[PDB]
């Protein structure tokens, strides 16, 4: 290393390139990259020098490569590269470089952005977005694959979110990228969209306006779960918006897709499928009817009764939200009770958290109010007692939280 360092600080350029390559190789060792002994050599600012304009492009390439891997280490190691002011030069290389240098520069920026929200935002206020978006006019798959990964890191992270006015500029590009034949490009593109769609209704509308949702629904049937997971997440984020925005996803045919996803070998996919459905049944009566027509209730009921708890929660939300459509259209409740939803709802009261208990109690009251209305014109109350639920609801009066008590109290007093 001491000879490599001296060789690097030469002014012989042959030698500078020779030393940089040697530094690159050791930082590219297949196991245990000696990043900190390289940092301790104090060669990082020198490597950044090799990336400036007017350097031989082979030297820029090898330097950017070495700095890329140093930045791929711990946060402290990434900090050394950032504090050496390498980021503005990385971005400069996105203009002046070749496809090989540009892929290297965007790779480095990906590691910097992928460190923390601070460095993510830092890359963005260094005005990196515009030259980055310009890269996607390339005919190089690997350049676009790497740039998409970097782009996803820029859209990633909450507390705080990235500057929306900046990252939203990527939406037309991301809209095209989800039509890619390259799987790795496809995956990171969907993750980026899932991040961007995770926000206010203004953010969701932006995703809708660039006509992303329909392609997302298509990608739900992709063979790889690596594609399905961020796609389902993005779709699930969109339907957290208002009824109009949700209807866009419905018109895109998400309901038959979600039925397929309910039988996924991945538990987390089944959970987020339930979660997506629940935010659709949270909409108007017509949208609840659409869920029912799509034959989604029977697998939801079974998941409510057998699945893992984290999945049960979302299935509960779906059935409970659907029951709210019961006051306006009582046949919704009749169908829900007919599909045996009462007992799995009741059984949940003894194990669930206070929020789900509250969700469950609202479902049970809706069923009761309807069953009560189907009297002046209680079956459901009888079904609930036989379900062992009357006991469970009574026990909820022993809950420390007031809104659950008040709720359970009125339910018991009104219908029992």
């Amino acid at each position: 290393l001491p000879q490599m360092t001296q060789q690097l600080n030469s002014d012989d350029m042959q030698e500078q390139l020779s030393a940089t390559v040697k530094f690159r190789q050791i930082l590219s060792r297949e196991h245990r990259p000696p990043i900190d002994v390289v940092i301790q050599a104090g060669v990082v600012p020198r490597l950044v020098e090799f990336m400036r304009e007017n350097q031989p492009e082979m030297l820029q390439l090898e330097a950017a490569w070495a700095l890329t891997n140093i930045a791929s280490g711990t946060s402290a190691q990434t900090k050394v590269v950032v504090d050496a002011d390498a980021v503005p030069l990385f971005i400069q290389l996105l203009y002046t470089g070749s496809v090989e240098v540009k892929e290297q520069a965007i790779w480095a920026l990906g590691n910097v952005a992928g460190d923390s929200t601070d460095y993510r935002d830092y890359v963005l206020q260094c005005n990196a977005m515009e030259p980055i978006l310009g890269l996607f006019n390339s005919n190089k798959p690997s350049l676009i694959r790497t740039a998409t990964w970097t782009l996803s890191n820029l859209c990633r992270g909450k507390k705080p979110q990235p500057d929306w006015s900046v990252v939203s500029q990527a939406l037309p590009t991301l809209a095209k990228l989800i039509y890619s034949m390259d799987t790795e490009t496809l995956v990171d593109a969907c993750w980026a969209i899932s991040y961007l769609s995770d926000g206010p209704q203004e953010a969701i509308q932006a995703v809708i306006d660039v006509r992303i949702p329909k392609r997302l629904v298509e990608l739900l049937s992709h063979e790889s779960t690596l594609v399905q997971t961020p796609a389902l997440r993005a779709v699930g984020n969109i339907v957290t918006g208002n009824d109009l925005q949700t209807q866009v996803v419905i018109n895109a045919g998400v309901l038959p897709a979600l039925r397929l996803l309910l039988s996924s070998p991945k538990e987390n996919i089944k959970k987020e499928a339930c979660w997506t459905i629940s935010n659709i049944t949270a909409g108007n009566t017509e949208q609840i009817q659409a869920v029912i027509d799509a034959n989604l209730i029977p697998p939801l009921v079974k998941l409510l009764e057998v699945a893992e708890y984290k999945t049960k929660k979302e299935a509960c939300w779906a059935i409970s939200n659907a029951s709210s459509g019961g006051l306006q259209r009582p046949d919704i409740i009749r169908y829900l009770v007919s599909q045996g939803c009462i007992k799995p709802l009741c059984d949940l009261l003894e194990i669930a958290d206070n929020r789900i208990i509250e969700v469950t109690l609202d479902a049970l009251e809706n069923i009761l109010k309807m069953g009560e209305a189907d009297k002046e014109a209680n079956e459901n109350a009888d079904f609930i007692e036989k379900a062992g639920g009357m006991e469970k609801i009574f026990n909820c009066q022993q809950n420390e939280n007031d809104k659950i008590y008040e709720k359970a109290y009125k339910i018991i007093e009104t219908y029992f």
């Binding site: 280490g73 790779w107 590691n111 992928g114 460190d115 992270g157 957290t240 987020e272 929660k313």
Partner: peptide, 17 residues
């Protein structure tokens, strides 16, 4: 009403090997 079912910043880095 709608709902979301954790703000964790795992490092997302790739070394060139």
């Amino acid at each position: 009403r709608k709902h979301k079912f954790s703000t964790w910043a795992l490092p997302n880095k790739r070394r060139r090997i």
